[PDB]
RNA sequence: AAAAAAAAAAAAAAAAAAAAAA
RNA sequence: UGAGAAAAGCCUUCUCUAGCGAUC
């Protein structure tokens, strides 16, 4: 594995964040791509990035990381773009997501639980 | 070495001369720096903070130091080319004000026949402008030095004198400006 | 309570001595002021060895060393040295204090009434120091500051964008700056030869022909066979020479011949070092940014960094404002500049400008966070912009 | 709308030494470049008449949005020395390298070695700045980097702030010094109200030898953060 | 009062250009209006006091 | 204005419960044969974490042997002991200036010139002993008080 | 006495050495246009003054341009003027609203005056 | 609060400036 | 408030910090 995609989840973690993918989109709280992905971030208003390590240049997402650190938000890499594609009711591989700040919504224990397992994985 | 040396001459020499840190401890450089002067530059060279400089890097900024001192040479040369021109034209002039400040007048002017038909008041303030204009609209008191405030006498005289020199100066000054205008002779007499 | 502290700094290793203390009331009101006051301080405390470091590598070496908390050889040589052989050795991490008893038999003490002695150390070192080393103790933290981040980070000094910033600027400037000068120079040669002006349709190129010929009165046979050389035809200088025996010029002076020589010379050899600011941007942009060179150019390139401000943020721009750094100079819209095989029709105009900045975009990432810059990339985006160039010229 | 390019504008000093309000149709806070031309960010800057102050973004900085709220005093003046834990990209960093001047110092901490590679590039051009690619967490490991200071400004956003906090203060923290910490309460404790968590913290500054001083909330701008401001071993009066 | 000053005594009145009375009467009628705006939130503050 | 309140609505208050303790509710808890923590929890139907400051530890201290057994009842592990570095012992003064800066504590107390005070404070309940029961005062989520 | 003098001329170290501006008719009419602020839109308010007076140490200048806000934030160069008061004197919007109020005021005055 | 005086502005208003009552 | 109020120049009495000093 490329080192540069260091927080890689194993395989219970994967299942989780997917699960939670397809749940948010369902709500009107996804944004995809890695162009949108990068816009919330600049307003502020994402929970975490969720990103592709399978993308053939990796270096094309690496922006995002460094715009993580500012903002102090979580983000994590799984091992497939398609898996990752199906999850958010698109019909193409998808190499970066982000969720959004809803006032309200109902994913907010779930979602709360997603970001500690998250730093976890940072130790 | 931009803070110990001033002159920025001697520092693009310095420049030419010696490329890195490592080359200063070994070149001399008594013909450009005095030598105490140079036991502090070469003191400074081993205690640094910089950052270490590519090849060519270091040959961009020779280039670009070569052109300074090339300029420098010029302009030199052609400030004695009008010490030339303003010597043989109105040398009267030149010897009473200087050649500078000789020089703008008729660049203000825009001749010197132009500025032979200006009165004694007009030639002293001929450079400010912007404070007689105001003055006259505000009705205050006018200003008086324009642009002879660089010549050679009244730079020299006490502040609280510099008012009488300045219209001593130019009352006399365009009584040259005349004579060189008009006069069919070429000489110093009359000026000095 | 008499102890030995070593206190580690970047100038280098230092072993004092301690006397006495009141150690139970040491963080009180009254007590406090034994180690914040300096003469007091000097009462109680002795430098009994100083071993500075000698050279800047060698400073990074130890700090390496301090940093594991491995006993380095310099460190080790001073203890073994002015230390006699029952000692307690004061030390502010732990890890080193162990190591030590491990080589040297000192017993080393970590917490106590020696951490209020190392802030006191700290606060006065630069008295008790000064005058022993030639570099200051101030210049030494700077400077071991970088390097030991440096080497963290790996950092590479080749993949610096600082040069292509300032190089862009100064290219502005100097076009500008020949600029004036060359209308100057045409001026001031038109009163001796007016004709030359209309023949010649480059001010750079008006410049050697000045130097080349002082006079127009001695012009002919050899000296008209060199100026076919420098002229691209060979007709304009045969036609040169008929100026010159017809013209209505003036006769000019010595001394205002000179003049005019040395000046017009001058803007050459301005002309040429601007030649070599162009030479040295593009090399310096196939190690900066290569993927983004091959593609767009090294002059757009350049200005596209720029305008972003450094390397670093022109990556983290998203795709739709990486247009609007070109909207003003046309950068995207204006092309052969960059030239592309192939056209645009002034319908798809704008479409072809915006699928050309999201290519700049991704381009841009792969030179600032790839390990090692290479090119490949950058050409392969070339051919799609071409293929697309060429599927809306001919609709398929 | 906001302030456009090419408005006539006025700057004039702020309550606090070295930093700056734009006085305009609308007001900002700005501080004086050191690098005059150039903008780390991409925020506005106004030129006048040799010299150049950048425009301060109180959303993006937590220091800024403080200062914008009121609070009484920040202890960073000119000619400071000052160490800041958590400098991330440098976004507040340039801003508190603008107010210490070329007499201060900044000492930048981040272990993060993707942000930390932006720290050197800033202070390539900013001479006050040290870099220090270190954790936190252990303050021994760069002893030898960092001398006394006066002012330590935390934002780590850390469950152990308190710890990370009170070890540098007592390595490099000066008598008579002062800490600024953010506190983010999700971060401490989300099962935890946000005002019992600012209430944990201080009592455990004051465990550590610390006398917290003021507290206040960066409402406007931010959700359940504050700000506190204290005084580390004061001398006597 | 004392409103007469003799022949020889008295000086002619400035004459403005047409550009500084635009901008001198756009002063006096902004204080106008501003100077109003204050006087009736002045009012409504003492009634709810 | 603190960001907790809701107008008099104190909303950052929160199931567990933390509660300054005054050295006479103390006393008076122990002749009625009251457990503390236990009718606190009664009274609330959540955890409840009392606090004791050193102003009120100390006034216990000055009283002598004859109240020893409500010393070592003080001293309990369960119990949060929280510091205060204040030039005195006196502890009304000391518990306002902690109600007045946090807005996060239930006042426990039975004087009533203390009560006076803190209800001029907003949004701060206050709990005292009526009959043989604890009550509160001020306290939206009452739930299990007595009802009367 | 002579070093109070200096002393007060310039804002001091705190703030990297200001100076006073000598005080102009252009200079004040600024300042009095940005003291009256609160008046210029309808649809915006503003907080109290700082101070009642003038400003001692303050200084001019104009916002430099960005690359990257072409069209979110940029006066095309024709708008530009050199003073405030020059560029209250260019835009319709207040023009239009100041006109109005101030012929409001002269009439319900002329009705008590009468 | 109020009777004044000195300036500008708009087709009267606006800033300063004194006295008197309270 | 009522050694009336306001301004300039000379002596007298004292207050704060900040280095400096304690290393024999
Ligand atoms: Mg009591
Ligand atoms: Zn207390």
Not at chain 4, 141 to 164: C, E, G, H, N, S
């Amino acid at each position: 594995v490329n080192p540069k995609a260091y927080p890689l989840a194993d395989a219970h973690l994967t299942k989780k964040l997917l699960d939670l993918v397809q749940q948010s989109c369902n709500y009107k709280q996804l944004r995809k791509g890695a162009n949108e992905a990068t816009k919330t971030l600049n307003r502020g208003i994402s929970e975490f990035i969720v990103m592709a390590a399978d993308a053939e240049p990796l270096e094309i997402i690496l922006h995002l990381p460094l715009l993580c650190e500012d903002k102090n938000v979580p983000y994590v890499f799984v091992r497939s773009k398609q898996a990752l594609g199906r999850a958010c009711g698109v019909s193409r591989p998808v190499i970066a997501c982000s969720v959004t700040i809803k006032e309200g919504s109902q994913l907010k224990q779930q979602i709360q639980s997603i970001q500690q397992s998250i730093e976890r994985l940072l130790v | 070495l931009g803070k110990i040396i001033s002159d920025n001459l001697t520092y693009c020499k310095c420049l030419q001369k010696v490329g890195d840190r490592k080359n200063y401890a070994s070149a001399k450089l008594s013909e450009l720096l005095p030598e105490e002067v140079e036991a502090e530059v070469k003191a400074a060279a081993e205690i640094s903070m910089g950052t270490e400089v590519s090849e060519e890097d270091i040959c961009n900024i020779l280039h670009l130091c070569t052109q300074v001192i090339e300029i420098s040479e010029y302009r030199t040369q052609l400030y004695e080319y009008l010490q030339n021109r303003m010597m043989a034209i109105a040398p009267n002039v030149t010897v009473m004000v200087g050649e500078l400040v000789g020089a703008r007048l008729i660049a203000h002017a825009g001749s010197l026949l132009n500025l032979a038909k200006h009165a004694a008041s007009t030639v002293q303030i001929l450079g400010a402008e912007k404070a007689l204009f105001r003055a006259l609209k505000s009705r205050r008191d006018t200003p008086k030095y324009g642009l002879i405030y660089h010549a050679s006498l009244v730079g020299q005289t006490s502040p609280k004198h510099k008012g009488k020199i300045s219209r001593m100066l130019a009352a006399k000054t365009v009584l040259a400006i005349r004579y060189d205008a008009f006069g069919e002779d070429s000489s110093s007499a009359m000026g000095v | 309570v008499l102890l030995h502290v070593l206190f580690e700094h970047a100038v280098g290793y230092a072993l004092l001595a301690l006397k006495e203390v009141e150690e139970i009331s040491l963080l009180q009101p009254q007590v406090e002021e034994s180690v914040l006051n300096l003469g007091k301080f000097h009462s109680i405390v002795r430098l009994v060895a100083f071993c500075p470091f000698a050279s800047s590598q060698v400073a990074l070496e130890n700090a390496n060393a301090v940093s594991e908390g491995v006993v380095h050889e310099d460190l080790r040589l001073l203890l073994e040295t002015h230390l006699p052989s029952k000692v307690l050795l004061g030390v502010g991490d732990p890890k080193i204090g162990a190591a030590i008893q491990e080589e040297l038999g000192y017993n080393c003490q970590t917490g106590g009434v020696i951490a209020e002695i190392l802030r006191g150390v700290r606060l006065h070192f630069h008295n008790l120091v000064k005058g022993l080393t030639d570099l200051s103790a101030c210049k030494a933290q700077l400077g071991l500051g970088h390097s030991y981040s440096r080497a963290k980070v790996k950092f590479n000094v080749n993949r610096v964008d600082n040069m292509i910033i300032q190089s862009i600027s100064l290219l502005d400037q100097l076009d500008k700056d020949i600029n004036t000068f060359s209308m100057r120079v045409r001026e001031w040669y038109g009163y001796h030869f007016p004709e030359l002006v209309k023949i010649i349709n480059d001010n750079a190129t008006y410049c050697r022909l000045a130097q080349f010929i002082g006079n127009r009165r001695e012009l002919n046979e050899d000296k008209l066979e060199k100026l076919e050389e420098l002229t691209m035809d060979g007709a304009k200088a045969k036609a040169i020479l008929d100026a010159s025996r017809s013209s209505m010029g003036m006769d000019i002076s010595a001394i205002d011949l000179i003049n005019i020589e040395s000046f017009s010379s001058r803007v050459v050899s301005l002309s040429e070092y601007r030649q070599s600011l162009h030479t040295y941007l593009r090399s310096k942009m196939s190690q900066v940014a290569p993927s983004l060179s091959a593609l767009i150019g090294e002059a757009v390139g350049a200005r596209l960094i720029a305008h972003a401000g450094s390397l670093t943020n022109l990556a983290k721009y998203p795709a739709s404002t990486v247009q609007i750094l070109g909207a003003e100079k046309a950068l995207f819209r204006a092309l052969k500049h960059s030239t592309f095989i192939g056209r645009a029709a002034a319908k798809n105009k704008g479409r072809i400008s915006r699928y050309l900045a999201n290519k700049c975009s991704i381009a841009s990432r792969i030179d600032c966070f790839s390990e090692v810059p290479t090119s490949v990339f950058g050409e392969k985006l070339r051919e799609q912009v071409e293929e697309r160039l060429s599927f809306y010229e001919t609709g398929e | 709308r906001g302030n456009q390019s090419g408005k006539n504008v006025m700057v004039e000093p702020h309550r606090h030494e070295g930093v700056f309000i734009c006085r305009g149709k609308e007001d900002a806070l700005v501080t004086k470049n050191l690098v005059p031309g150039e903008s780390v960010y991409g925020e506005k800057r106004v030129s006048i008449s040799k010299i150049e102050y950048r425009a301060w973004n109180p959303f993006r900085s937590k220091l800024a949005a403080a200062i914008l709220g009121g609070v009484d005093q920040i202890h960073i003046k000119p000619g400071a020395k000052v160490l800041y834990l958590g400098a991330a990209s440098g976004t507040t960093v340039s801003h508190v390298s603008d107010i210490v001047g070329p007499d201060g110092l900044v000492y930048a901490v981040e272990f993060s070695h993707r942000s930390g590679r932006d720290l050197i590039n800033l202070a390539k051009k900013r001479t006050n700045i040290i870099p220090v690619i270190e954790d936190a967490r252990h303050p021994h490991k760069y002893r030898m980097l960092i001398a006394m200071v006066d002012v330590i400004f935390a934002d780590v956003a850390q469950p152990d702030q308190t710890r990370i906090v009170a070890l540098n203060a007592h390595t490099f923290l000066r008598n008579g010094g002062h800490f600024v910490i953010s506190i983010k309460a999700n971060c401490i404790d989300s099962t935890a109200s946000a005002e019992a968590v600012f209430a944990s913290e201080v009592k455990k500054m004051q465990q550590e030898n610390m006398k917290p001083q003021e507290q206040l909330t960066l409402e406007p701008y931010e959700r359940d953060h504050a700000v506190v401001v204290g005084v580390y071993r004061p001398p006597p009066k | 009062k004392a409103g007469k000053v003799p022949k020889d005594r008295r000086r002619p009145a400035v004459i403005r250009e047409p550009h500084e009375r635009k901008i001198l009467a756009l002063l006096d009628a902004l204080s106008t209006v501003h100077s109003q705006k204050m006087k009736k939130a002045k009012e409504q503050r003492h009634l709810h006091n | 204005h603190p960001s907790c309140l809701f107008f008099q609505y104190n909303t950052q208050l929160g199931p567990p419960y933390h509660i300054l303790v005054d050295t006479n509710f103390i006393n008076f808890s122990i002749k009625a044969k009251l457990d503390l923590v236990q009718s606190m929890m009664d009274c609330l139907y959540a955890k409840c974490i009392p606090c004791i400051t050193d102003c009120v530890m100390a006034e216990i201290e000055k009283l002598g042997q004859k109240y020893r057994v409500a010393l070592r009842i003080a001293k309990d592990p369960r119990f949060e002991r929280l510091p205060c570095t204040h030039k005195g012992t006196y502890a009304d003064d000391c518990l306002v200036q902690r109600v007045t800066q946090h807005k996060c504590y239930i006042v426990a107390t039975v004087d009533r010139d203390l009560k006076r005070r803190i209800r001029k404070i907003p949004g701060v309940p206050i709990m005292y002993i009526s009959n043989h029961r604890y009550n509160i005062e001020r306290m939206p989520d009452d739930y299990g008080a007595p009802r009367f | 006495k002579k070093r109070r003098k200096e002393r007060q001329k310039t804002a001091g170290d705190g703030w990297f050495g200001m100076k006073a501006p000598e005080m102009t008719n252009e200079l004040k009419n600024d300042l009095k246009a940005l003291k009256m602020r609160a008046s210029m839109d309808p649809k915006r308010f503003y907080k109290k003054n700082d101070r009642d007076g003038f400003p001692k140490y303050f200084q001019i200048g104009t916002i430099v341009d960005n690359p990257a806000d072409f069209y979110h934030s940029r006066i095309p160069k024709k708008q530009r003027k050199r003073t405030i008061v020059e560029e209250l004197l260019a835009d319709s919007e207040f023009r239009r609203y100041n006109r109005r109020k101030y012929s409001e005021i002269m009439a319900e005055k002329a009705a008590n005056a009468a």
